[PDB]
Write a protein that binds this ligand. Structure first.
Ligand SMILES: CCCCCCCC/C=C\CCCCCCCC(=O)OC[C@H](COP(=O)(O)OCC[N+](C)(C)C)OC(=O)CCCCCCC/C=C\CCCCCCCC
Ligand SMILES: CCCCCCCC/C=C\CCCCCCCC(=O)OC[C@H](COP(=O)(O)OCC[N+](C)(C)C)OC(=O)CCCCCCC/C=C\CCCCCCCC
Ligand SMILES: CCCCCCCC/C=C\CCCCCCCC(=O)OC[C@H](COP(=O)(O)OCC[N+](C)(C)C)OC(=O)CCCCCCC/C=C\CCCCCCCC
Ligand SMILES: CCCCCCCCCCCCCCCCCCOC[C@@H](O)COP(=O)(O)OCC[N+](C)(C)C
Ligand SMILES: CCCCCCCCCCCCCCCCCCOC[C@@H](O)COP(=O)(O)OCC[N+](C)(C)C
Ligand SMILES: CCCCCCCCCCCCCCCCCCOC[C@@H](O)COP(=O)(O)OCC[N+](C)(C)C
Ligand SMILES: CCCCCCCCCCCCCCCCCCOC[C@@H](O)COP(=O)(O)OCC[N+](C)(C)C
Ligand SMILES: CCCCCCCCCCCCCCCCCCOC[C@@H](O)COP(=O)(O)OCC[N+](C)(C)C
Ligand SMILES: *[C@@H]1O[C@H](CO)[C@@H](O[C@@H]2O[C@H](CO)[C@@H](O)[C@H](O)[C@H]2NC(C)=O)[C@H](O)[C@H]1NC(C)=O
Ligand SMILES: *[C@@H]1O[C@H](CO)[C@@H](O[C@@H]2O[C@H](CO)[C@@H](O)[C@H](O)[C@H]2NC(C)=O)[C@H](O)[C@H]1NC(C)=O
Ligand SMILES: *[C@@H]1O[C@H](CO)[C@@H](O)[C@H](O)[C@H]1NC(C)=O
Ligand SMILES: *[C@@H]1O[C@H](CO)[C@@H](O)[C@H](O)[C@H]1NC(C)=O
Ligand SMILES: *[C@@H]1O[C@H](CO)[C@@H](O)[C@H](O)[C@H]1NC(C)=O
Ligand SMILES: *[C@@H]1O[C@H](CO)[C@@H](O)[C@H](O)[C@H]1NC(C)=O
Ligand SMILES: *[C@@H]1O[C@H](CO)[C@@H](O)[C@H](O)[C@H]1NC(C)=O
Ligand SMILES: *[C@@H]1O[C@H](CO)[C@@H](O)[C@H](O)[C@H]1NC(C)=O
Lengths: 1277, 119, 173
């Protein structure tokens, strides 16, 4: 009804209740389109003018029977009400109620209540409000109170379907105003103040379109039920394992053996309170809070001579890193799963209980910190996608339902499309590369050249702006969106010229002007614009959440961090990362979002209570991470296919570079012919039998097996060559002679292949080229060895290429071949994405080197490492005048900094990875000017550089990479038929078969044995409650395993032993009765097999454990055999179904990750040998110490496994860059060996670690893809 | 270190006077540094006088007119350093001071109490 | 880093010999101050006699007419944290065959107290007229050649067998 608008009058009141009167005298869903909040449809057209914002008749047929009315805005918005008097007082024509509606149905109302809130927040941002802010507080309270009031006497308190209190979001305004009145009248208050924070959550109510956003987040969380259950379960199981193994281990410290005046461990340990007191009796490395660990084994930490390894004291890191009680094990393994500074746990456990406990930390990082995270990112994605899909479907369905003129035209013909634009772009690239040549120790001449260049370029760009501005009118000139940009840039240039350092660097964004001829940069601009465009509300939500958590953290913990600073920092001054300001609170919340959430949490707890710190941090992390994952996913899927679908042609107005390039092939090809025409115008069977033999032999599986075994022996033989080789002299001789034999066999290999396949086919295959190069290396090395040229420079740096010997393995292992082909098919694309990322990071790097370059120098008292305070010695000359009279003073940089664009790229690689960025921010935000001693946070507001950087380079670039990888993989899968690209042909059979195990629904129900007694046993076991009970008692046993702690008591140990015995007895009994029931059928059920096995292992374990402890002595074997019990828990999996399917997905996916694991192991082997050869003699520093280093194959594989997750790689890399003393010493003696010098080579070191981190990143991306596609395949099935 | 004290104290003559000095220090009070300085002064012009303290153990200097009437009646571990005034007279009417230093917290606490006697 | 490698046990006559004695420390970062004594029991005598003492930069040689000018110090230099204590013999004789002990006394420096430990290394020395080649080296060399030759004959045997087979098949074709 387009023209059915009737003022809701006395007759409306009159008519309605006799309708409802006959309904109650005689005793369909409402129009979704017309339901309030949305917009009025176009079917009713326009509204009579005076009828707007008035009580109107009800349109929806469903509500037509009942007694309501609707009021419509000038913005065509539906506001429905109920015609019952408000509080039985305000009838629909009471004059107060009319004007109340007029306010409520008015946009300026929202504008006011929003302009108040967005200033209330800015008032929240202050930690110590001045006395004048009481007035503001009171006025704010008044505005909220009466703006809620205008709701009440219009909407209605509680007597209606539509009445105020009904909407959940009008709960919050009510509660805040009543609490504000309360606290104002009951007059610590910090908890009450936290609810004033709650005000700024009305933001979500006021601005439209976030109601839907938060609804979406809620419905998307609703799906992560079973994954969170399984995360809790798996974390708990590994927590039990870690509890059993390491209970009390991290409490080891080295205690002096020479105590004077009759004391003991106990006698001291009762009377000790200091760090100094603990230093006089334990072993503390220089500059550390915790006591050095130690272990009772040969593969553990070694106490200094004079100390003995004892278990006493407090656990490390204030006492919070432990495996002592179930809860602390949960905390430690959650820290492992989120990989938050897990490498310190890695080193602490290894130093405590030994290196051979590396297997534990491997099984978890592979499973816990990968398989859970993927299951989460896959579930969230899968949800999101369903909603985007339904949304798109719905949107679609709904849509479906005189002289001036002379020279201006002259200049316009001098717009010449093919060429002037190319001149400008080459000017752009020449500028950017000219501005990438700053550096700190830059001479005055370079300074001059750079300045002059900047000036010439500025001039050219400006000239083209003014020329085209006179060319065509500003009315259209300022319509082209790129035009506004250029004008802006020229204006900025002029302002810079006539006056900050940051202002020098807005001439950089011209690099985007190449995006016209650059399609991948167009993709990137599509992401950047999208995040402020069609998904800008979700980014606003992220901003809101960060604000809320920032201010809550400040309100709760702010004072604490100031009364209790001495607990967390020795100098009685606030730490670096604290919650006493709004800005620093924001920084800590940002850091929690990036993923480094313990250390701040330890400080938090140490000053302000474990419970409130824990609840906040866990909540911050979860909520934030969820919202960020949702943003990432959205952008990725929008940009994936929903961004554009090639609706328009490739550069519809053919690209000016493509117009230009035609004039090039017009030029180059024609002129190529003009110089061409002018220059011509001016001027027997036996050999084939040998071939077929050699062909036949090399194909034979005996030969191939021989060569594979040969390759494995070479690979292994490489690993013996370490630092300790001079000790094992016989092995030294054997290895030389075996290497000689090996090269012999391998050249015979070459000769047979050459004659078999022929030179051609052998030279046109990649693997044969690889082997050819390798055996060439071997041959040259051998000959030079036998000719005495065995020590002359490069022929010793050529030997270190023996480490490439394993690279022959890839050509023999199928899985390795299939992974290599899959990863090589996607390099072409990855290269374009990488190059965009590089130019972008180059813009950031020039911003950096302009802001910071040359200012990280600082005097350092090298004995302790404390920079001299800027009260005395504020500058260079002072640092030198100090060294000449004092000592151990140096003007020392950071070695990874911004002194030029290259080191800039390096330091940015550190920041974007969060592994070592902390020292860069610290030494940057301290900066003053070149040749100046820094001051503590003297430039505090440089952290925003890092925040912006972090945001773009880690968040958008990661998105871009992931998008391209997925796209290519889709290509690499779709083209071949859906085949998994990580599985060999036999692996495919296995997978297909393993799939049919997950598809069998029915089985015969085990006919019932005849005899009455066993029949009763049968109908007992097959009853539903039997299993329910058994799993209840399984949980009752799991808790019996949880209740243990550290040093509990003698009595408790026995009493738990006895409960354990009773459970064991019941379980064994169930098993026996079950067997009796399904006689001879027990084994038809794989789960029952598992069960038999566990019962048996468990009985065995109890008995064996008893035996060993009683007669033998073996603590470690005792603990490792008491782990048989853990199997009893794994039967929780039986009853579940939300977990079985997920673990069956992991079982499905296993072989692919097997092949990537093989490739990763081979790469780790090669890099291990490389490290063994080069960095076995570097100094011992940040990451390289007495236990984690490259001196041996075990140590090097430990270090590389650690940085496979990219963890702590800056720490290892830092002691390799040192060179040219005083950083190192090149004339060290190194007893027991002839090598000299103790510092490494920067270039090879940088190559080593950078190369490794990209390759590790690429293989783990492949692992991600494998598990994620497996989950999609299982879930949609 | 905030100090929680009643600014004005009226106690009946001859009765018992509870003079509460308390603080909230986040650091565990340890007797090997924590110090209590118990002083009193009558008129602002007239001089401050010390009667109790705490260096290692509770020290009472047993002053004239403060003799055998003051003993420590609180325990520093639970942040309570209250003292009692036995059988108050008109004389002790004046302004009472409790100075607290609780290392390692640097800020030196200070409570002030006005004691008045009613006939 | 530091590796404790045992000394070689044969010396050729009328030549140079270095008697290796490395004594690492348990933790590499500590700080010590060490000096070393060497005693030497000749083959046939039953008592060990002090021969040389090294303290802080100076080797003090005992007045023994078998080591007048034939030993010069050759371990770690320029420090007091001696960790490689090898000596060098510059002119070997037949009186140098006997039994040795490398007495290293290490006084450590810690946060509040000092340790006086002790380590002893025992070396047996046989002087000879010409250098005998190590048994493992000889066996390894002959093994290298014997595997080389057996692999050659294995391969050629397969070449002849496959040649006969394919040739026969070709005549038949
Ligand atoms: C979904 C997300 C929900 C988030 C909200 C709920 C999450 C956590 C709530 C934790 C509540 C903890 C309440 C306090 C517990 C408590 O006060 O009990 C004390 C014990 C032992 O204290 P202590 O005697 O060793 O003190 C040492 C003193 N010192 C170290 C200073 C010398 O502390 C303990 O066991 C507790 C240690 C931590 C326990 C596990 C925390 C959860 C870990 C991961 C959750 C991931 C999701
Ligand atoms: C995106 C993820 C990967 C990012 C990796 C970035 C790594 C960049 C790392 C290092 C580059 C600069 C390293 C500078 C090292 C500090 C020393 C220094 O500051 O000295 C600059 C050198 C000096 O020479 P000198 O000291 O040897 O000689 C003089 C010898 N003396 C001193 C005895 C007289 O000046 C020169 O020559 C500089 C020559 C080297 C310039 C390299 C430029 C690298 C460009 C792009 C890197 C990314 C490539 C693509 C990666 C794809 C993945
Ligand atoms: C250290 C601390 C923890 C210690 C724990 C110790 C206990 C752990 C494992 C003990 C051995 C478990 C062996 C399980 C074999 C299960 C099985 O009986 O294998 C068959 C199942 C398929 O089951 P079905 O019912 O179709 O076979 C029934 C036969 N039919 C086809 C006629 C219906 O294949 C499968 O799931 C194979 C599953 C393989 C799972 C390996 C990892 C287990 C964890
Ligand atoms: C995939 C195939 C990858 C290539 C094949 C690798 C085979 C696996 C190669 O690993 C075996 C070598 O590590 C043996 O060396 P050790 O661990 O015995 O050396 C240590 C020496 N110490 C400990 C006695 C001082
Ligand atoms: C210090 C210098 C260190 C230099 C290290 C150099 C490492 C080199 C790594 C080479 C890593 C291996 O190179 C990969 C190529 O062999 C791949 O060959 P294609 O993709 O052409 O083969 C396709 C096979 N289908 C498709 C026909 C089955
Ligand atoms: C993709 C990236 C494409 C652009 C890559 C540009 C890399 C960097 C290209 O810029 C070249 C400059 O680095 C060369 O001069 P430097 O600044 O290195 O001079 C150093 C002088 N000192 C410090 C040794 C005294
Ligand atoms: C896939 C592989 C991707 C990574 C490949 C490597 C990219 C980065 C390589 C940087 C390799 C950069 O090395 C050159 C710089 O280290 C030169 O600096 P220095 O002055 O220390 O020169 C050393 C003189 N000694
Ligand atoms: C897929 C498999 C890919 C395997 C890639 C392996 C990449 C190779 C390692 C990259 C990391 C390369 O650094 C390893 C170094 O041993 C190379 O030694 P140089 O050739 O620089 O010799 C210099 C030796 N001095 C000068 C120090 C004595
Ligand atoms: C550099 O730091 C060292 C070590 O902290 C300072 O050396 C201390 O000097 C004072 C007297 O100036 C001595 O009482 C301390 O015992 C010294 N410390 C140690 C560990 O021995 C040195 O003063 C600092 N350098 C300067 C001159 O600022
Ligand atoms: C370097 O630091 C000194 C710090 O003292 C600056 O001040 C000079 O200090 C010297 C030594 O005390 C005095 O003799 C000079 O008179 C001080 N300067 C002035 C202007 O009075 C000094 O200016 C700094 N110079 C630079 C280039 O940083
Ligand atoms: C044990 O302590 C007593 C102090 O009562 C002391 O006299 C005695 O020397 C001590 N014994 C030893 C062996 O130190
Ligand atoms: C250091 O400066 C002082 C002050 O002039 C001077 O006496 C001394 O010789 C200088 N030392 C060196 C090594 O330049
Ligand atoms: C060792 O000394 C003897 C006697 O001086 C001398 O004949 C002999 O040549 C010397 N041999 C060597 C290798 O110095
Ligand atoms: C070697 O020893 C014999 C006796 O044992 C002695 O007569 C002779 O002089 C010694 N020679 C040297 C070179 O010390
Ligand atoms: C060892 O002895 C020889 C012989 O004089 C000498 O040249 C060398 O410097 C000594 N030290 C080392 C480390 O070789
Ligand atoms: C260390 O022990 C040796 C062994 O006798 C002794 O000669 C030396 O004086 C001792 N040094 C100290 C400082 O105790």
């Amino acid at each position: 009804g387009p023209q059915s608008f009737v003022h809701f009058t006395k007759q409306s009141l009159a008519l309605i209740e006799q309708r409802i009167a006959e309904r109650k005298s005689k005793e369909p869903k409402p129009s979704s389109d017309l339901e309030a909040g949305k917009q009025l449809p176009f079917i009713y057209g326009d509204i009579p003018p005076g009828m707007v914002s008035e009580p109107l008749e009800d349109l929806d047929p469903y509500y037509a029977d009942k007694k309501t009315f609707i009021v419509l805005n000038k913005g065509k918005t539906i506001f429905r009400f109920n015609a019952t008097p408000a509080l039985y007082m305000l009838s629909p024509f009471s004059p107060l109620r009319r004007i109340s509606i007029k306010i409520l149905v008015h946009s300026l109302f929202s504008m006011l209540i929003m302009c108040t809130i967005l200033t209330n927040c800015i008032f929240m941002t202050m930690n110590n409000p001045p006395d004048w802010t009481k007035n503001v507080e009171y006025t704010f309270t008044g505005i909220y109170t009466f703006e809620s009031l205008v709701k009440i006497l219009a909407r209605g308190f509680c007597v209606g379907e539509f009445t105020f209190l009904r909407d959940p979001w009008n709960w919050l305004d009510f509660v805040v105003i009543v609490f504000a009145y309360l606290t104002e009248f009951v007059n610590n208050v910090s908890a009450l103040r936290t609810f004033r924070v709650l005000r700024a959550l009305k933001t979500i109510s006021v601005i439209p379109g976030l109601k839907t956003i938060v609804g979406a987040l809620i419905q998307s969380v609703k799906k992560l039920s079973d994954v969170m259950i399984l995360t809790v379960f798996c974390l708990s199981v590994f927590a039990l394992i870690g509890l059993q193994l390491f209970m009390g281990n991290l409490k080891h410290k080295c205690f002096r053996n020479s105590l004077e005046n009759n004391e003991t461990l106990e006698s001291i340990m009762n009377t000790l309170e200091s760090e100094e007191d603990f230093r006089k009796y334990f072993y503390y490395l220089e500059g550390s809070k915790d006591a050095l660990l130690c272990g009772f084994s040969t593969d553990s930490g070694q106490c200094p001579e004079g100390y003995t390894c004892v278990k006493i004291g407090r656990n490390p890191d204030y006492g919070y890193t432990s495996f002592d009680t179930f809860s602390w094990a949960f905390l430690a393994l959650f820290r492992l799963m989120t990989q938050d500074y897990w490498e310190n746990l890695y080193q602490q456990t290894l130093r405590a209980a030994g290196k051979t406990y590396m297997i534990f930390f491997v099984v978890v990082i592979f499973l816990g910190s990968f398989y859970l995270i993927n299951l989460i990112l896959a579930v969230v994605a899968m949800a999101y996608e369903e909603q985007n899909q339904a949304n798109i479907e719905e949107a679609k369905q709904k849509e479906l339902e005189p002289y001036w003129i002379k020279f201006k035209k002259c200049i316009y013909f001098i717009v010449m499309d093919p060429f002037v634009d190319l001149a400008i772009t080459i000017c752009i690239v020449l500028n950017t590369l000219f501005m990438a040549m700053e550096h700190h120790p830059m001479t005055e001449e370079f300074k001059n050249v750079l300045a002059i260049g900047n000036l010439v370029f500025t001039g050219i760009f400006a000239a083209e702006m003014v020329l085209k501005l006179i060319a065509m009118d500003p009315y259209e000139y300022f319509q082209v969106g790129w035009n506004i940009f250029d004008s802006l840039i020229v204006t900025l240039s002029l302002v810079e010229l006539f006056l900050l350092s940051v202002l020098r660097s807005f001439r950089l964004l011209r690099v985007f002007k190449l995006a016209k001829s650059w399609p991948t940069l167009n993709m990137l601009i599509k992401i950047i614009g999208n995040s402020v465009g069609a998904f800008g509300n979700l980014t606003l939500v992220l901003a809101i959440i960060v604000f809320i958590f920032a201010v809550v953290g400040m309100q709760l913990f702010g004072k604490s961090y100031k009364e209790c600073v001495c607990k967390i920092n020795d100098d009685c001054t606030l730490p670096r990362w604290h919650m006493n300001d709004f800005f620093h609170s924001f920084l800590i919340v940002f850091r929690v979002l990036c993923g480094e959430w313990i250390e701040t949490m330890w400080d938090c707890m140490e000053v302000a209570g474990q419970a409130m710190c824990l609840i906040v941090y866990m909540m911050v992390m979860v909520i934030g991470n969820l919202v960020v994952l949702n943003l990432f996913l959205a952008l990725l899927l929008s940009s994936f296919s929903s961004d554009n679908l090639t609706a328009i042609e490739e550069d519809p107005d053919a690209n000016n570079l493509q117009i230009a390039v035609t004039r090039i092939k017009k030029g180059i090809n024609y002129v190529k012919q003009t110089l061409r025409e002018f220059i011509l115008k001016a001027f027997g069977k036996i050999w084939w039998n040998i071939r077929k033999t050699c062909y036949k032999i090399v194909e034979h599986s005996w030969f191939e097996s021989f060569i594979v075994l040969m390759i494995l022996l070479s690979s292994g033989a490489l690993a013996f060559e370490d630092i300790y080789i001079e000790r094992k002299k016989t092995i030294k001789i054997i290895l030389e002679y075996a290497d000689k034999i090996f090269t012999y066999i391998f050249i015979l290999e070459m000769l047979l292949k050459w004659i078999a396949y022929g030179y051609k086919t052998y030279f046109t295959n990649a693997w044969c080229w690889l082997d050819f190069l390798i055996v060439d290396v071997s041959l040259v090395t051998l000959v030079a060895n036998t000719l005495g040229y065995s020590d002359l420079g490069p022929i010793k740096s050529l030997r270190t290429l023996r480490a490439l010997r394993p690279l022959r393995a890839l050509s023999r292992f199928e899985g390795m071949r299939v992974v290599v082909n899959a990863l090589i098919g996607a390099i072409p694309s990855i290269m374009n994405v990488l190059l965009v990322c590089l130019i972008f990071w180059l813009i950031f790097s020039i911003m950096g080197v302009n802001l910071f370059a040359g200012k990280f120098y600082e005097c350092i008292n090298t004995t302790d490492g404390s920079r001299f305070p800027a009260s005395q010695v504020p500058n260079r000359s002072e640092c030198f005048a100090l060294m000449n009279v004092s000592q151990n003073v140096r003007w020392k940089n950071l070695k990874v900094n911004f002194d030029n664009v290259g080191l800039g790229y390096l330091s940015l690689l550190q920041v974007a990875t969060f592994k070592g960025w902390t020292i860069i921010m610290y030494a940057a935000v301290d900066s003053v000017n070149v040749d100046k001693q820094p001051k503590y946070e003297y430039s505090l507001y440089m952290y925003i550089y890092f925040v912006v950087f972090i945001i773009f380079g880690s968040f958008f670039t990661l998105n871009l990479f992931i998008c391209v990888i997925i796209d290519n993989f889709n290509q690499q899968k779709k083209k071949l038929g859906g085949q998994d690209i990580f599985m060999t042909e036999e692996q495919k059979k296995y997978y297909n078969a393993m799939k049919k195990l997950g598809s069998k629904k029915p089985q015969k129900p085990i006919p019932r044995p005849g005899n009455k007694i066993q029949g009763c046993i049968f109908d007992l076991v097959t009853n539903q409650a039997f299993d329910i009970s058994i799993m209840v008692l399984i949980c009752l046993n799991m808790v019996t395993m949880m209740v243990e702690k550290e040093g509990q008591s003698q009595h408790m140990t026995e009493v738990l032993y006895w409960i354990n015995v009773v459970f064991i007895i019941l379980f064994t009994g169930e098993c026996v009765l079950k067997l009796i029931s399904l006689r001879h059928y027990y084994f038809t059920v794989g789960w029952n097999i598992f069960d038999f096995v566990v019962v048996i292992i468990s009985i065995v374990g109890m008995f064996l454990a008893d035996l060993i402890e009683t007669y033998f002595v073996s603590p470690t074997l005792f603990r490792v055999i008491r782990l048989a019990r853990i199997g009893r828990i794994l039967r929780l999996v039986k009853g579940a179904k939300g977990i079985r399917t997920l673990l069956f997905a992991l079982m499905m996916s296993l072989p692919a990750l097997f092949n990537i694991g093989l490739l990763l192991f081979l790469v780790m082997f090669i890099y291990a040998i490389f490290g063994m050869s080069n960095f076995a003699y570097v100094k011992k520093e940040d990451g390289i110490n007495d236990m984690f280093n490259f001196e041996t194959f075990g140590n090097s594989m430990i270090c590389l496994f650690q940085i496979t997750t990219s963890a702590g790689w800056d720490g290892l890399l830092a002691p390799i860059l040192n060179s040219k003393p005083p950083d190192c010493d090149p004339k060290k003696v190194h007893p027991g060996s002839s090598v000299e010098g103790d510092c490494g080579n920067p270039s090879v070191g940088i190559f080593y670690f950078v190369s490794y981190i990209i390759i590790s990143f690429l293989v783990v991306v492949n692992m991600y893809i494998a598990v994620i596609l497996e989950n999609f395949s299982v879930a949609t099935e | 270190m905030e100090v929680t004290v009643p600014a004005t104290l009226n106690v009946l003559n001859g009765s018992d006077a509870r003079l509460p000095c308390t603080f909230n220090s986040c650091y565990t009070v340890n007797h090997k540094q924590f110090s209590l300085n118990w002083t009193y002064q009558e008129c602002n012009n007239c001089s401050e006088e010390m009667f109790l303290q705490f260096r290692m153990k509770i020290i009472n200097l047993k002053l004239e007119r403060f003799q055998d009437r003051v003993e420590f009646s609180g325990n520093p571990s639970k942040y309570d350093v209250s003292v009692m005034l036995r059988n108050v007279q008109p004389e002790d009417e004046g302004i009472y001071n409790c100075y607290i230093m609780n290392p390692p917290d640097r800020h030196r606490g200070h409570g002030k109490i006005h004691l008045q006697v009613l006939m | 880093g530091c590796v404790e490698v045992d000394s070689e046990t044969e010396a050729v006559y009328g030549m140079t010999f270095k008697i290796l004695c490395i004594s690492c420390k348990r933790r590499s970062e500590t700080n010590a101050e060490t000096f070393t004594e060497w005693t030497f029991r000749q083959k046939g005598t039953e008592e060990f006699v002090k021969i040389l003492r090294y303290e802080n930069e100076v080797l003090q040689l005992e007045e023994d007419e078998r080591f007048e000018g034939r030993v010069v110090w050759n371990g770690s230099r320029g420090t007091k944290d001696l960790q490689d204590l090898s000596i060098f013999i510059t002119n070997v004789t037949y009186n140098h065959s006997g039994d040795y002990e490398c007495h290293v006394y290490r006084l450590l420096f810690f946060e509040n107290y000092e340790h006086n430990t002790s380590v002893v290394k025992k070396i047996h020395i046989e002087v000879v007229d010409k250098a005998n080649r190590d048994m493992a080296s000889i066996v390894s060399e002959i093994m290298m050649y014997v595997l080389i030759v057996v692999l050659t004959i294995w391969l050629v045997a397969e070449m002849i067998y496959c040649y006969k087979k394919i040739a026969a098949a070709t005549e038949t074709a």
